[PDB]
Design a protein around this nucleic acid. Structure first.
Ligand SMILES: Nc1nc2c([nH]c(=O)n2[C@H]2C[C@H](O)[C@@H](COP(=O)(O)OP(=O)(O)OP(=O)(O)O)O2)c(=O)[nH]1
Ligand SMILES: [Ca+2]
Ligand SMILES: [Ca+2]
Ligand SMILES: [Cl-]
Ligand code: NA
Length: 327
DNA sequence: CGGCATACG
DNA sequence: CGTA
DNA sequence: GCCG
């Protein structure tokens, strides 16, 4: 078992679902307390279990796995012995956990805002709706649309939506393309939102595209919310339903074709996979990775990539298709 | 012990 | 601060 | 919380 998640395949479905879920509750709780280091360790330990070829049945099977020390091992031990880990259950039922989860799920609310609201004594969505002058415009939209946004987006909804985005994109810039990224590209049958990456095969033609796309989608009556030069838009969109519609979150991002493989890689995720890939790049290869490129700070040069395959090759990693990046 | 990804709106 |  |  290699130490970095980007060095091993992680499928979407696996053989240690209950154990990984438990560790991820502790990760999430660590994040609510601003403990990013402990969040990372618990996430990494969970991901290791996702990468195993069979179920963990005995404590000795953790021997030598990376990211399993005293704490993560005791969590697995208790689950294996009793079907339950008392620490995890105590977190699950804490008012702090439940409220921080509720608040941070709102579009426009992060951990820092949720925490402040918590310290002010706020506990429920109706507590937030009573004092709406305290909310940003983004938070107001998040709160109004919270119920629809809490419902998973189905993969079967996505093609119709991609077609409406493609129509708007084609008018904004003929020849521009739309690629489905995120968890759906990794094989997920549901997600909390849809992610589209937009480019054009002629370098430079994509400059100024996103505002033109957004104005057209808004003219079609499809945009319930958006922030508005820019290149990422975090939208709420009107998705058709039988006799009606529902609000869904859609992310749109533009990249020049030169950057497209880096953007595709980044936006395809998973989040842990990307953090691990960027950590690997910098710490093991001395190269700086982001969704725009890969930089050699000694040479002061950017690596040209025509494909995700190029990027794994420039990092000395075995290629993983999107379906094996579910770290 | 230091480090923990790295951007844009 | 929020967002990916 | 864990590695290196
Ligand atoms: N949410 C999130 N995504 C990030 C971050 N950094 C980063 O590179 N990404 C990449 C990894 C994600 O897989 C990708 C798209 O984000 P997402 O939240 O829509 O995640 P997803 O498609 O995998 O999940 P879901 O919609 O199925 O719930 O963006 C981050 O801080 N938060
Ligand atoms: Ca998504
Ligand atoms: Ca998204
Ligand atoms: Cl970036
Ligand atoms: Na939020």
């Amino acid at each position: 078992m290699p130490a970095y998640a980007c060095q091993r395949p992680t499928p979407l479905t696996h053989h240690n679902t209950g154990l990984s879920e438990a560790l991820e509750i502790l990760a999430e709780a660590a994040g609510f307390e601003g403990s990013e280091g402990r969040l990372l360790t618990f996430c990494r330990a969970a991901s290791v279990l996702k990468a195993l070829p069979s179920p963990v049945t005995t404590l000795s099977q953790l021997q030598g796995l990376p990211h399993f020390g005293e704490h993560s091992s005791r969590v697995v031990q208790e689950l294996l012995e009793h079907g339950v880990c008392e620490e995890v259950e105590r977190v699950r039922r804490s008012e702090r956990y439940q409220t921080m989860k509720l608040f941070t799920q709102i579009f426009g609310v992060g951990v820092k805002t949720a925490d402040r609201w918590y310290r002010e004594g706020l506990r429920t969505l109706d507590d937030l709706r009573e004092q709406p002058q305290k909310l940003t415009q983004q938070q107001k939209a998040g709160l109004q649309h919270h119920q629809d946004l809490s419902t998973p987006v189905l993969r079967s909804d996505v093609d119709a939506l991609q077609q409406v985005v493609e129509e708007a994109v084609g008018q904004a810039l003929p020849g521009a393309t739309v690629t489905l990224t995120g968890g759906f590209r990794r094989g997920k049958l549901q997600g909390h939102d849809v992610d589209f990456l937009i480019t054009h095969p002629k370098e430079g033609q994509e400059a100024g595209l996103l505002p033109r796309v957004m104005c057209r989608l808004q003219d079609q009556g499809l945009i319930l919310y958006h922030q508005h030069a820019f290149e990422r838009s975090f939208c709420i969109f009107r998705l058709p339903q039988p006799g009606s519609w529902k609000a869904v979150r859609v992310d749109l991002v533009v990249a020049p074709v030169s950057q497209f493989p880096f953007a595709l890689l980044g936006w395809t995720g998973s989040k842990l996979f990307q953090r691990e890939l960027r950590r690997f790049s910098r710490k093991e290869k001395g190269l700086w990775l982001n969704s725009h490129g890969l930089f050699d700070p000694e040479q002061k040069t950017f690596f040209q990539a025509a494909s995700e395959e190029d990027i794994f090759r420039h990092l000395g990693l075995e290629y993983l298709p999107p379906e094996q990046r579910n770290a």
